[PDB]
A paper describes a structure:
[name] DNA gyrase, an indispensable nanomachine involved in the regulation of DNA topology, is the only type II topoisomerase present in this organism and is hence the sole target for quinolone action, a crucial drug active against multidrug-resistant tuberculosis. DNA gyrase and topoisomerase IV consist of two subunits (GyrA and [name] in DNA gyrase, ParC and ParE in topoisomerase IV), which form the catalytically active heterotetrameric complex (i.e. A2B2 and C2E2, respectively). The breakage-reunion domain contains the catalytic tyrosine responsible for the cleavage and religation of the DNA double helix.
We solved two high resolution structures of the [name] domain displaying two different conformations of the metal-binding site, to 2.1 and 1.95 Å resolution, respectively. When magnesium is substituted in the crystallization conditions by calcium (TopBK crystal II), side chains of the triad are observed in an inactive conformation similar to the one observed for the low resolution [name] [name] domain structure. The structure displays a two-domain organization, a globular domain constituted by discontinuous segments (residues 448–564 and 633–654) and the Tail domain (residues 565–608) connected by a loop-helix-loop hinge region (residues 609–632). In the globular domain, the conserved acidic triad (E459, D532, D534), which constitutes the signature of the [name] domain, binds the magnesium ion essential for the catalysis of the cleavage-ligation reaction. The [name] domain forms a dimer with a symmetry related molecule in both crystal structures (crystal I and II), burying 1017 Å2 at the protein-protein interface, indicative of a biologically relevant interaction. Surprisingly, the high resolution structures of TopBK, revealed two disordered regions, between β1 and β2 (residues 460–474) and between β2 and α2 (residues 484–492). These regions are structured in the context of the catalytic core or in presence of DNA. In the structures of type II topoisomerases in complex with DNA, this loop (hereafter named DBL for DNA-Binding Loop) constitutes the interface between the [name] domain and DNA and is stabilized through protein-DNA interactions.
Residue numbers in the entry:
A (entry chain A), B (entry chain A): 448 to 464, 474 to 483, 492 to 654
The structure:
């Protein structure tokens, strides 16, 4: 439960699923700060914002953003990384911010546990290794290509994106957050 | 992600682990409302408090409190049910508040999936049924008696307390919340 042993997952957006807290974010910067879901995330982090930001009050060692690979999922991650870059910058600078890579494929092996691939390369690798081991797979429907997080059952979502020994996390750098901030400014101007 | 398909789990306290949001609560009523963890829970619910309470702004269909059976776990559940009874009463009245019953025992069957018991009666029943079916168990260490939520691995905690088809939930009635409020007042006076 301790901040050092605590993580906060922010699950985005309209196609959604060590202490692991979880908060949603569904989907004008002043209007976004008034949004209830945004307010809950900011409050849970416990640092305060802008000039009131206090790193010592950080409630979570890791902040993990989880969204779909599509434009809808990108839009929400862009929004949250911009809010963090503009009002809670040391969270990014000190390496607390991460992006969860959801699995792209589920390999439905006939008489064994299903395997999950995070890229086309891993899918091909796992398929070859499985067939070589003697595992069986249906050529027509044995490989499920995920379209969103909502397609996964809650148990497999945890196994693939939240289990620390299995999950694929990418650290958000200051340059990554600056690129999200630029993207936000471009889209607002459009 | 929709409020109707959303649940908020409040995991208590110092011995801790359909969209399922999760928030911690570790462990003078005016001082409690200023606490960051309490503020995050209230904010996530989205209704506001006291005269500002708006049922229409409720972000979660179910509010589930999960704590250890000991005095430490009871103290936190007493505190949160009191806050809900005093400042967010319709959440209890409208049947949104529940208590999660964590498993008391894990039956470590030798060559099959482990089973979980929520009472001494269920433990005895499952043990008899398993041995009758031909399942094997070690008489010395095969039955683990849980002392707290922190003893469970994250995956089994979800399977037993968060899976809607498996979990054991008890609805918090207005009388239940009134008894928690009385208990809080007695302990504060002590």
């Amino acid at each position: 439960t301790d901040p050092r042993k605590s993580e906060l997952y922010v699950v985005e957006g309209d196609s959604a699923g060590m202490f692991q807290a979880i908060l949603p974010l569904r989907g004008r910067i002043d209007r976004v700060l008034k949004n209830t879901e945004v307010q809950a995330i900011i409050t849970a982090l416990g640092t305060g914002i802008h000039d009131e930001f206090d790193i010592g009050k950080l409630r979570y060692h890791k902040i993990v953003l989880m969204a779909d690979a599509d434009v809808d999922g990108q839009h929400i991650s862009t929004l949250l990384l911009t809010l963090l870059f503009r009002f809670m910058r040391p969270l990014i600078e000190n390496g607390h911010v991460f992006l969860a890579q959801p699995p792209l494929y589920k390999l439905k092996w006939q008489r064994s546990d299903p395997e999950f691939a995070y890229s086309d390369r891993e899918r091909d690798g796992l398929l070859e290794a499985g067939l070589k081991a003697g595992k069986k797979i249906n050529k027509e429907d044995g490989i499920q290509r995920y379209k969103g997080l909502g397609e996964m059952d809650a148990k497999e979502l945890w196994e693939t994106t939240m289990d620390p020994s299995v999950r694929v996390l990418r650290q958000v750098t200051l340059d990554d957050a600056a690129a999200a901030d630029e993207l936000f400014s471009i889209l607002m101007g459009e």
